[PDB]
Amino acid sequence: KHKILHRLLQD
Amino acid sequence: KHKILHRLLQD
Amino acid sequence: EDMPVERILEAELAVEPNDPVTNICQAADKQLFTLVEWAKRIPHFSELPLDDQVILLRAGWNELLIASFSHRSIAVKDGILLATGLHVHRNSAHSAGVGAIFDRVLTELVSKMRDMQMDKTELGCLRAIVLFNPDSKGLSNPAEVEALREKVYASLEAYCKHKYPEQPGRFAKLLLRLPALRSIGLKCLEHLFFFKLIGDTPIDTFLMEMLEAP
Amino acid sequence: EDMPVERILEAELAVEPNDPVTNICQAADKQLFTLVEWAKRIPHFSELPLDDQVILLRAGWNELLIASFSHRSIAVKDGILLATGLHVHRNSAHSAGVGAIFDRVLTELVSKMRDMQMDKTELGCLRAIVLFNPDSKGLSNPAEVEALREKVYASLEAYCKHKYPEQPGRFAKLLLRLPALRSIGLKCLEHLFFFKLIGDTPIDTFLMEMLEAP
Numbered sequence A, B: 001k002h003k004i005l006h007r008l009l010q011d
Numbered sequence C, D: 001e002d003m004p005v006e007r008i009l010e011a012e013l014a015v016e017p018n019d020p021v022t023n024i025c026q027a028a029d030k031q032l033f034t035l036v037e038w039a040k041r042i043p044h045f046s047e048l049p050l051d052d053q054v055i056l057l058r059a060g061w062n063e064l065l066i067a068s069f070s071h072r073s074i075a076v077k078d079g080i081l082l083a084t085g086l087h088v089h090r091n092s093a094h095s096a097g098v099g100a101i102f103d104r105v106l107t108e109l110v111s112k113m114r115d116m117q118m119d120k121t122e123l124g125c126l127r128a129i130v131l132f133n134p135d136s137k138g139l140s141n142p143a144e145v146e147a148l149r150e151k152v153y154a155s156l157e158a159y160c161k162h163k164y165p166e167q168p169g170r171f172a173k174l175l176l177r178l179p180a181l182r183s184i185g186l187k188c189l190e191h192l193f194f195f196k197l198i199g200d201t202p203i204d205t206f207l208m209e210m211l212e213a214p
């Protein structure tokens, strides 16, 4: 869950 | 409208 | 200009010396009368036009009542102490279907008031700041109400800093419970509207009147 | 202990240089990406565990986004200035059926920010205080988040009192918009959930993801 948010935060 | 409230406030 | 924390504390000390949800509603109706007498004891509240006194109480009665029994439940283990002299334990509220909101009251309110040992004087003010809500729709002179709100939190910051010097951030910590209270207040009303719709749960005349339009 | 208003202002200046409701949703989706970059620029936010960064943004994205375009609309007559570079006038919002909430944003937010000339630095902090919400469910270490929130409003009170000496009550006036923001934020989400249900109104992937469970 929360795919987009996680990606944006790791980057 | 608001019968009770008005009475309690005037008293 | 004339809003002493002493008069506020006096309003507080003067007003307060089977289905858990039904018991809760009976208590709320009960507290609605007392809240009127409380407001009357708050400096300058009574000098406002009757229409603004009605608006202010209709706009805040829920948050005002939630702050009171929360602070009243500070010594309770896992539950709140109703004014009817009845205790509602976490589990009781859970098995009645209202555990989520009840948990938010314990965590966001009761617990925090306990962690910072909020005192009766500080409560009185927070409730006075809530009563004087300049954002209430209908107000004939909102600026006036905004003035009262500023005198209240000025006296509170004064009380703090002076009574809790070691704690420079106590004033803010107190005002920062207001967003939580407002949020929990909105959720509680939704429940009250649902209970009314459902048809079960007895709702007394004064509490019923609060759920009227607008 | 290391929360300078300067770094906060930098996060703010770094992120921001036909159916009105559809345009509003397109803008919100747009701003959701920028909000992530904004958060990253807020001191110590990135040092928290990824899970808490997700919780904090999912819990506050709406209030955070509402504070931004409200302050951005301070110079506008009767409407807000969207990030897509589009203006939504009071009447436009009224004829689309969302006049009530739009009016609450103009009155409780935009207007007040204008009356007190709230500055970008003050905004940044209020948004930083909102980001660091210790009450967010799921937090692995809420006390830590509470620490950050206290450093933020300490630096803000410092900025005030020093930048607005003549105004001893400015710090409180700023924190007192938080209950309003939270309230308007909850109402806005309800609308967003209704629009989703209805089926009309295009909702982009990032905004959609925010309306997921929990």
Ligand SMILES: CCC1=C(CCC(C)C)/C(=C/C(C)CCCC(C)CC(=O)O)CCC1
Pocket: C021, C024, C025, C027, C028, C029, C031, C061, C062, C065, C066, C068, C069, C080, C081, C082, C083, C084, C098, C101, C102, C105, C188, C189, C191, C192
């Ligand atoms: C269960 C949801 C509900 C609440 C909140 C209950 C709270 C104890 C979690 C309600 C809150 C209000 C506004 C009433 C509070 C008044 C009381 C309990 C008075 C008192 O005892 O001090 C009434 C409608 C139903």
Ligand SMILES: CCC1=C(CCC(C)C)/C(=C/C(C)CCCC(C)CC(=O)O)CCC1
Pocket: D021, D024, D025, D027, D028, D029, D031, D061, D062, D065, D066, D068, D069, D080, D081, D082, D083, D084, D098, D101, D102, D105, D188, D189, D191, D192
């Ligand atoms: C019309 C109700 C609604 C709102 C509030 C609109 C507000 C301008 C009154 C919404 C508020 C949010 C969370 C979005 C805001 C993002 C914007 C407009 C981004 C920006 O332009 O800064 C989206 C869902 C629908």
